[PDB]
């Protein structure tokens, strides 16, 4: 069960990594600060890192208790 759940993440890891890395935000939202600020405030954003490795690190933090369940779910979603 764990290996299937992680294999679903890893088999699509390259396309979700390329999608997150090539996330071109629109201009009027940057000029009028309409985007989410907190999203990256907690560093949840999977930018600059491999998506599957960031999933592993986030799940390790969630297991260790330093990460809330809701923020982990929000970052994954």
């Amino acid at each position: 069960t764990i290996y299937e759940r992680l294999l679903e993440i890893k088999q699509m890891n390259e396309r979700v990594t390329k999608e997150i890395n090539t996330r071109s935000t629109v201009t009027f939202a940057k000029d009028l600060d309409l985007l989410s600020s907190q999203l990256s405030e907690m560093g949840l954003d999977f930018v600059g890192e491999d998506a599957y490795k960031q999933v592993l690190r986030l799940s390790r933090r969630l297991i260790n208790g330093d990460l809330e369940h809701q923020w982990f779910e929000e970052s994954l979603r």
């Binding site: 629109v26 009027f28 985007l35």
Partner: protein, 384 residues
């Protein structure tokens, strides 16, 4: 052995299929509102239109303001008493029409707002002028999002629909075209349009709808038409959460078989936005690509078509999918970065064109859709 599980191919336009596109928009349509707590909002029309203007799509098409329909022209399908009641009822004199309120199903689930007659006139005029421009050859694609009221019937208002403008448009198409195919990708069944053209072979009404205990309840697979209209009303019952690949692998074979079997001369395409994921009343899981793939696939046949926008009760998603569908009819693919419009605050948090599908269960199994498409294909053998 009819249904094939195929992944959703990316949307590609055909450069050899350039169409003269006519756009029908009356700036007033949006200033009408069903109610305070009501899901249907004509305001979705003008934020869709604001996305057309701000994408610079008006340089590849002609924008028209159709003349609003008069009383009689509405009576080409509806009765005199129903149009007379619609043109006279207001929220003020609702107590003066109580028998007609329950007779014509107006007052609950189809409320009386004081711009009702004008809204219906705009919708019917847009549909009829799009059909007329298709008849004279002035355009190849007629776009009218002001209408789409496919639930309205001869003497009643149902499903937030009062004037069945699609029947008026198909009537105007039938004066110059022998066979008109109506395609309904709205999540609800096109009961008004199918009921109107149930007994005729001149109009084939195809509806891709959710059929459960869902509105309007009509739309069983065995509903194939009676009399001379037998096997000329294709109903495709679907379950919840159909995704883009599943909807494509259902839609494209059925519409292709209708194209090479029924051979229509004009196409009416109901682009209900309630087939999108995240709709207030809809229960499908279509992204904007999945919704627009039907419009792009029906565009490939070259038949003079009338794109008419129907449902859609979350305004942002239906506006974005109508803008993408309209851009697809000009043989361009709009970039997934929304321009600045006056309603830019709706499309958060990413402010992009895309409508993201939900991660809910695609319960439409391949065996069920295989049986559905097998019976549909078997019924279509008599339409040559």
């Amino acid at each position: 052995m009819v249904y094939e599980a195929t992944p959703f191919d990316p949307i590609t336009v055909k450069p050899s299929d350039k169409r003269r596109v006519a756009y029908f928009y009356d700036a007033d349509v949006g200033n009408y509102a069903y109610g305070a707590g009501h899901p249907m909002k004509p305001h979705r029309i003008r934020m869709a239109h604001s996305l057309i203007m701000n994408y610079g799509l008006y340089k590849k098409m002609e924008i028209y303001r159709a003349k609003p329909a008069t009383k009689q022209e509405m009576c080409q399908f509806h009765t005199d008493e129903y149009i007379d009641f619609l043109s006279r009822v207001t929220p003020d004199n609702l107590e003066m029409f109580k028998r007609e309120s329950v007779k014509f199903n107006v007052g609950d689930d189809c409320p009386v707002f004081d711009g009702l007659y004008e809204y219906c006139s705009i919708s019917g005029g847009g549909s009829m002028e799009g059909a007329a421009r298709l008849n004279r050859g002035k355009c190849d694609v007629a776009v009218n999002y002001a209408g789409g009221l496919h639930h309205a019937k001869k003497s009643e208002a149902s499903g937030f629909c009062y004037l069945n403008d699609i029947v008026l448009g198909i009537i105007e198409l039938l004066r110059y075209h022998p066979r008109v195919l109506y395609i309904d990708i709205d999540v609800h069944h096109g009961d008004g349009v199918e009921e109107a053209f149930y007994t005729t072979d001149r109009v084939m009404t195809c509806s891709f709808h959710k059929y459960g205990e869902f509105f309007p309840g009509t739309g069983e697979l065995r509903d194939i038409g009676v009399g001379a209209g037998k096997n000329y009303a294709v109903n495709v019952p679907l379950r919840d959460g159909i995704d883009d690949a599943t909807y494509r692998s259902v839609f494209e074979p059925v519409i292709k078989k209708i194209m090479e079997w029924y051979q229509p001369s004009a196409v009416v395409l109901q682009c209900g936005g309630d087939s999108l994921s995240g709709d207030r009343l809809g229960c499908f899981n279509l992204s904007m690509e999945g919704h627009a793939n039907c419009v792009n696939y029906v565009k490939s046949f070259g038949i003079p078509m009338m794109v008419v926008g129907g449902g859609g009760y979350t305004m942002r998603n239906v506006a974005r999918t109508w803008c993408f569908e309209t851009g697809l009819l000009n043989n361009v693919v709009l970039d997934k970065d929304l321009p600045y419009n006056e309603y830019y605050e709706y499309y958060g948090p990413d402010y992009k064109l895309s409508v993201r599908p939900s991660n809910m269960f695609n319960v439409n199994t391949p065996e069920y859709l295989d049986k559905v498409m097998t019976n549909i294909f078997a019924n279509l053998e008599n339409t040559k």
